[PDB]
Amino acid sequence: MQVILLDKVANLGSLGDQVNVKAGYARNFLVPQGKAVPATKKNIEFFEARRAELEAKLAEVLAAANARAEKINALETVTIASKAGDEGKLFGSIGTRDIADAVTAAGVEVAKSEVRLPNGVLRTTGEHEVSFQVHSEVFAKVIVNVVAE
Amino acid sequence: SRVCQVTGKRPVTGNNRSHALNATKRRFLPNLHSHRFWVESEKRFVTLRVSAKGMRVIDKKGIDTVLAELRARGEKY
Amino acid sequence: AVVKCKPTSPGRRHVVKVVNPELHKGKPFAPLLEKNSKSGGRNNNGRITTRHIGGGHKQAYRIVDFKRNKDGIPAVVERLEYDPNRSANIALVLYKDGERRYILAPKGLKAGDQIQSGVDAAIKPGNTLPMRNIPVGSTVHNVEMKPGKGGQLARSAGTYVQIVARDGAYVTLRLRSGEMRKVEADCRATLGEVGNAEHMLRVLGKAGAARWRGVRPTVRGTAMNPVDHPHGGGEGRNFGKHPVTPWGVQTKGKKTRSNKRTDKFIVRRRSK
Amino acid sequence: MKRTFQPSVLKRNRSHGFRARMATKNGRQVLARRRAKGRARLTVSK
RNA sequence: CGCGGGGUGGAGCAGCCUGGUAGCUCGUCGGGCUCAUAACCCGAAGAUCGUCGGUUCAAAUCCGGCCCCCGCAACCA
RNA sequence: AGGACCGAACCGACUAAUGUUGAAAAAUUAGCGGAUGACUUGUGGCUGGGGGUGAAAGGCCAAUCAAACCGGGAGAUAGCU
RNA sequence: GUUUAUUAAAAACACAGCACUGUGCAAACACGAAAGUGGACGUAUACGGUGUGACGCCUGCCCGGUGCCGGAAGGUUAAUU
RNA sequence: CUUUAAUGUUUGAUGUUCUAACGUUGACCCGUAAUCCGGGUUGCGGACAGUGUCUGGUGGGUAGUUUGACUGGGGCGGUCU
């Protein structure tokens, strides 16, 4: 494995890689977010020539994970439109896995697919506590507010 | 499949001769990580079958050329 | 109900059958009944692979529900039936949200009672609820492996897998064999046990009955040959080792998991 | 004691056909080897 | 299959480490005691110290084989 | 009523007399047992040789089974006849 | 009930019950390169496999060795740095 | 030098932990009024089951081979200079 690694959160703390690696952070985290550069070792000297022009542009393309860590561990009051079955509960023949899913036909794509639940979420309209991925390595409580849909 | 989509491969001929010194066939295989990669201008995942050491080829060449040859072929379901 | 026989024929002397109050003539219409393609042990490759299963009278029995997840509305009942492969009774159930199915009986169900699927309101019995709100001292049936699947464990006449912790992101439950598993706390299950707990008074006593329930008779290993049981064949019934399975392992032991994904939830095991 | 051969040619035709057999490699190798030999039939099944 | 601690008169112990020195309790035999049996006490024989060899002026003890308990090797590109 | 019984057609074959270079690669006559049941069974379908399949005898795979067949390796090899 | 078709029809084999164990379901298990499908759409009162064989009375002593289950204080140990 | 904390620094191990790889006979819409298949979303396990390479334990379940002459024929026995 020989790549040019380009991220500035979670565990990476370089804006280049010029030698080989025992760990593929490429095709793992950085290629799911369009924020890596490829290498043949034919071009690493060249990359470091190109970097003086490039890096101030490139620094924002490697800001996609930064975004997520920054804007969600902040204190937040998340407004969610949610729906209630006929027993008045948001859980009649719904349960946990439909009370979240809604992006099925309309919207754009979203960065989420798992959250361990140490509490019950999305219970009824009002405030409730929701313990979540403030970043994809870092678990901490956000506040939710549920409104009618 | 053991055929990677960035290099041609075969499971090769393979014997012991290393714990009884008598050459009896056991055969050798690749791994075949049936492995997803991402396409950002389509906001989706597409899948390329790589083997062990064959992933290391994709890393050293560039994913993008391989990823473009599947687009050049069309995705089919 | 059960019907137990006295000595009044050979082959009748001890035999027991489960009957019901609400009876029906023949096969019932097709909106509740569907060709289940039953194969008596035979697979997609043309071979009997499940051994000493099958034979006897044909089956085509309904698929039933085990998902049980409901909008909380009352229901009517039409007739109560016993199943030919499940060991419990199954109601024909007509929920007032217009639904029509067969459903497995919980701790209670009747012709004027509902099932919930609510998170904090299905807290009563016989109503399907997430496992957070069920005690460390309360039985449970309907236990589903991941949230929304519907139960796979404790689905038989009087069977339960009772909760022994509920604290943290998992629920800890004890198994009717000696094993202990975690199940995530947001999976749905139901307070109590399955109906027809009285099944255990079915003693049987006619061998043709397991033949038509699609279970074939199985033979002594010492009358098998050594490829089907290695402690077998020869003259005058051999002993001087213990009995054996033909999978290259014993029969009084050797733990086995071919696919090992079953062990990822199992945090403790059966002992001897 | 009991009949040791059945008369029904149905079970012969769908065992040993042409079309159903060409599709598979090893049945195609029948049709090849028989044809090259020079026989007035390749299937004995119509 | 190697390195070290342990392996007691017919039975069970004390002694045990550069070590020799056989001593206590039972069964036995003489004595003592009880009206007598009894256990219990004194004395005496028994000593193959797991079994074989080796080192040492001296081996139960230290050293090497083996069988048995325990600590370690339980594995090698 | 009955995996009760006696019993045809329908299915089987414990015994007995015979057959034994036969009428017939177990059948006959006659006693005999299942026949409302784990029975009898037509059509269509399916697994191919140390592999199936077996209420198990190490049974059954084209009146054959304790090991079905052919085209090639092949002039297999035989301290051998 | 089943029984070596065309030798045994039984004193062998089967069964409910009884003990033992694997298996928590995408099951153990079977077969197939594996996807896969049967098991079962049933799910430990269920399913595989073991010895024993409805029913009344029962099964005393004990793991030397054999395979297997499980637990713990902890020394090292392939592979590898 | 040794042990060794703080900690700079490369690599091996660990505890607790996440979803972001990977799985998904979890679930909902969608191609598609296709039980396939795939992606989207979202539930759940998870850097693990998995599988290759290596390698240690177990294992005739399975397959290819191997298992004396001499000798008053001689099994076994005894003997082989």
Side-chain angles (χ1 to χ4, degrees), chain C residues 19-246:
Chain C
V19 77
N20 293 263
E22 302 182 287
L23 291 186
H24 178 76
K25 192 323 182 184
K27 72 94 217 172
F29 303 119
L32 297 172
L33 179 68
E34 61 263 276
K35 183 50 59 183
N36 68 342
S37 201
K38 208 174 189 313
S39 290
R42 173 185 162 276
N43 83 319
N44 81 335
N45 208 355
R47 293 183 176 197
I48 295 284
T49 46
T50 304
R51 308 299 159 104
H52 310 121
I53 211 176
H57 203 240
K58 58 264 183 82
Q59 287 186 249
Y61 77 103
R62 78 305 303 214
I63 201 174
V64 190
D65 184 89
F66 67 59
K67 186 177 198 193
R68 313 223 291 202
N69 277 5
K70 178 64 58 167
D71 75 351
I73 307 276
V76 185
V77 172
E78 183 187 343
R79 39 174 196 261
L80 195 56
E81 304 202 336
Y82 165 62
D83 202 282
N85 201 234
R86 147 176 299 114
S87 53
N89 299 350
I90 78 171
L92 209 182
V93 74
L94 291 168
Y95 296 94
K96 304 160 187 280
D97 59 89
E99 201 57 52
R100 178 154 65 119
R101 53 170 179 203
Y102 298 107
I103 198 180
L104 189 43
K107 177 161 157 67
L109 193 56
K110 59 175 176 189
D113 180 271
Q114 70 301 105
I115 294 174
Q116 288 172 260
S117 178
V119 50
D120 292 299
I123 56 175
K124 57 163 305 171
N127 286 60
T128 327
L129 184 66
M131 271 150 85
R132 297 182 182 286
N133 292 95
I134 305 189
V136 300
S138 186
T139 64
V140 66
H141 55 313
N142 203 30
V143 181
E144 75 200 29
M145 180 179 86
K146 304 188 283 163
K149 174 169 196 59
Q152 298 298 305
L153 279 89
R155 324 296 299 112
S156 283
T159 60
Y160 71 80
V161 283
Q162 169 180 350
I163 295 170
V164 291
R166 81 184 181 157
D167 194 60
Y170 297 79
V171 174
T172 310
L173 48 138
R174 186 239 76 261
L175 300 168
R176 308 186 51 116
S177 74
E179 183 183 300
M180 164 161 59
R181 64 182 281 109
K182 284 187 162 212
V183 166
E184 203 61 6
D186 73 320
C187 305
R188 280 164 300 296
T190 315
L191 286 88
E193 62 178 323
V194 200
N196 206 48
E198 63 150 83
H199 184 50
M200 71 191 178
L201 305 179
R202 164 168 156 153
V203 177
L204 304 136
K206 191 188 69 197
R211 184 58 167 257
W212 71 47
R213 279 172 70 88
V215 187
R216 293 182 311 232
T218 306
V219 300
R220 263 148 180 179
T222 49
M224 298 211 302
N225 56 19
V227 303
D228 287 311
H229 187 249
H231 191 52
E235 293 170 67
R237 214 182 299 198
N238 64 311
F239 289 109
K241 204 205 187 192
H242 59 292
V244 273
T245 57

Side-chain angles (χ1 to χ4, degrees), chain D residues 1-6 9-10 12-13 15-17 21-22 24-27 29-30 32 36-37 40 42 46:
Chain D
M1 195 199 78
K2 189 70 174 205
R3 205 179 195 148
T4 51
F5 198 33
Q6 179 158 98
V9 300
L10 263 306
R12 190 191 60 215
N13 304 352
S15 272
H16 312 116
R21 188 177 208 185
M22 185 166 207
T24 180
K25 205 81 190 196
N26 40 55
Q29 305 320 260
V30 168
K37 187 180 193 74
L42 298 189
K46 73 179 56 189

Side-chain angles (χ1 to χ4, degrees), chain A residues 1-3 20-21 26-27 31-34 38-42 109, chain B residues 35-38 40 42-43 45 55-56 58-64:
Chain A
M1 300 300 238
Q2 157 55 243
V3 61
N20 292 358
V21 287
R27 300 130 181 80
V31 183
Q33 289 182 259
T40 330
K41 193 175 188 93
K42 283 176 194 311
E109 283 69 64
Chain B
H35 196 107
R36 301 183 184 201
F37 309 92
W38 181 268
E40 193 49 273
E42 296 168 19
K43 299 287 279 175
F45 279 128
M55 195 160 159
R56 309 185 77 231
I58 231 173
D59 199 88
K60 192 58 179 176
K61 190 151 74 66
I63 186 61
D64 50 69

